């Protein structure tokens, strides 16, 4: 997926998917 988040996100999901 090219349209996914390209930025750094410290508040992204830190858990296991």
């Amino acid at each position: 997926n090219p349209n996914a988040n390209p930025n750094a996100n410290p508040n992204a999901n830190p858990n296991a998917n």
Epitope: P2, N3, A4, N5, P6, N7, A8, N9
Partner: antibody, heavy 123, light 107 residues
Framework: QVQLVESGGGVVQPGRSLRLSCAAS????????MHWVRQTTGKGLEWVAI????????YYADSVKGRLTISRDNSKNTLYLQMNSLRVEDTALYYC????????????????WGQGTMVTVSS | DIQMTQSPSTLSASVGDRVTITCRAS??????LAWYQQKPGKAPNLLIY???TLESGVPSRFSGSGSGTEFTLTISSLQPDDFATYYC????????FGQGTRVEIKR
């Protein structure tokens, strides 16, 4: 001041090379994905390539695959665009744009644009 | 390849007018749409993202609307610095721009 300053343009012959720079200042360059978007009066605004914030993912348009490679130096806050085997179809004004950090499922809004650098390929 | 078509291509307007710009989508793009403004010799500037959210620092006269395949950029009261060209860009699948809409001064 948040801004993007580009360099490396010029007129070259078909088949030669050219390296475009996009120096960033005023914000945290290491935490932003970057794009290259070229513009002509015939094709309009056309996306070229995208680089991830850490450089782990790269994606190119079909018309530039293999010939154009996008890179990034977070240590110097500069975005690069290596252009090889240049065709006359690559003649355009090239921009570098920052991906807006607006949380959603898709990301593609450009909130900061460079001033543009001109590439003219001709024999 | 998702194609962005803008209607109309050129429109006349005066200072204080309500202008409306249409952006068609070849396929559904939900609300993944951006609106830009470009003045001659200058890079484009983002006005609207996510179809209707207003970019910070942009005059509130600008407003976007629509979802799916039909979208709209609206300027409730056009000001002299609004005479430029406006592009719509989708970001549902890759990135594609419209052909642009020139806003000429009416006479």
């Amino acid at each position: 001041q948040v801004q993007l300053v580009e360099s490396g343009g010029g007129v070259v012959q078909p088949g030669r090379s050219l390296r475009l720079s996009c120096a960033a200042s005023g914000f945290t360059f290491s935490s932003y994905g970057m794009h290259w978007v070229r513009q002509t009066t015939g094709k309009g605004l056309e996306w070229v390539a995208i680089i991830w914030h850490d450089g782990s993912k790269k994606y190119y348009a079909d018309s530039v695959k293999g010939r154009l490679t996008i890179s990034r130096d977070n240590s110097k806050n500069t975005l690069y665009l290596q252009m090889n085997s240049l065709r006359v179809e690559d003649t355009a004004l090239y921009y570098c744009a920052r991906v807006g950090d607006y949380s959603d499922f898709k990301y593609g809004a450009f909130d900061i644009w460079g001033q543009g650098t001109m590439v003219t390929v001709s024999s | 390849d998702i194609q962005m078509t803008q209607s109309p291509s050129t429109l006349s307007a005066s200072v204080g007018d309500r202008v409306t710009i249409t952006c068609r989508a070849s396929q559904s793009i939900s609300s993944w749409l951006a609106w830009y403004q470009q003045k001659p010799g200058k890079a484009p500037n983002l006005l609207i993202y996510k179809a209707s959210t207003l970019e910070s620092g942009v005059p509130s006269r600008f407003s976007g609307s629509g979802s799916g395949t039909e979208f709209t950029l609206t300027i409730s009261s056009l000001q002299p610095d609004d005479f430029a060209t406006y592009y719509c860009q989708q970001y549902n699948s890759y990135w594609t721009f419209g052909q642009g809409t020139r806003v000429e001064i009416k006479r």
